[PDB]
């Protein structure tokens, strides 16, 4: 299997009141 | 006269994120017309009047317009040594082209002892030769090919 793998076990967590999940 | 956009195909800087600072970027280009053109009969284009000249090569880098405060937070994280980026070649490979003589049937292979820790399959195919040179200098004016490589 000639292939790649990337950061994927974490997802777009956004609400239906903001397209951006904040950062502290 | 032509105008073309040519991408970076090298598997370490074609998807890299590059932080603030000044860098020196250079990449060299090939003006051999048997390596940058293709033919439909595979006829040599250096026994024909094909030629090329380059006048002006620009670099166009397209910047995402960060908010400054968010930008510096992003930079600080990726200046930590635990958040180092990491890439692998898609065809992660080592290429060995063993010659097959004309009308040969059998092709032995000699590989000196190596570690085979973290090895994956063999993959193989048969090429075709006798014309054009190999990568490393991309010229040799006794050319004889120009078709699909």
């Amino acid at each position: 299997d000639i292939n790649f793998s990337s950061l994927a076990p974490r997802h777009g967590t956004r609400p239906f009141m903001g397209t951006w999940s904040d950062i502290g | 006269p032509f105008h073309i956009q040519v991408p970076q195909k090298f598997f370490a800087i074609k998807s890299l994120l590059l932080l603030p600072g000044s860098y020196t970027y250079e990449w060299n280009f090939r003006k051999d017309v048997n390596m940058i053109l293709q033919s439909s009969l595979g006829n040599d284009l250096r026994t024909d009047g094909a030629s090329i000249s380059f006048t002006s090569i620009n670099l166009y880098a397209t910047f995402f317009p960060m908010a400054h405060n968010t930008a510096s937070t992003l930079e600080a994280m990726l200046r930590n040594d635990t958040n180092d980026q990491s890439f692998n070649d898609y065809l992660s490979a080592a290429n060995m082209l063993y010659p097959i003589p004309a009308n040969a049937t059998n092709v032995p292979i000699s590989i000196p002892s190596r570690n085979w820790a973290a090895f994956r399959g063999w993959s193989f195919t048969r090429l075709k030769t006798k014309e054009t040179p190999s990568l490393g200098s991309g010229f040799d004016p006794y050319f004889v090919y120009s078709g699909s490589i």
């Binding site: - | 284009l45 094909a50 060995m96 082209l97 003589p101 490393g136």
Partner: protein
């Protein structure tokens, strides 16, 4: 003669095994320099 039983052999004329060397100098004994190309 050569053999008809005694081991697990095989016949071909020039013995070669190598790999890929780089750069120019791949052709000699071919029609001369042409540079930007002419018939």
């Amino acid at each position: 003669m050569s053999g008809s039983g005694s081991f697990e052999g095989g016949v071909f004329s020039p013995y070669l095994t190598g790999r890929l060397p780089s750069w120019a100098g791949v052709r000699q004994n071919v029609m001369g320099s042409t540079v930007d190309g002419r018939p």
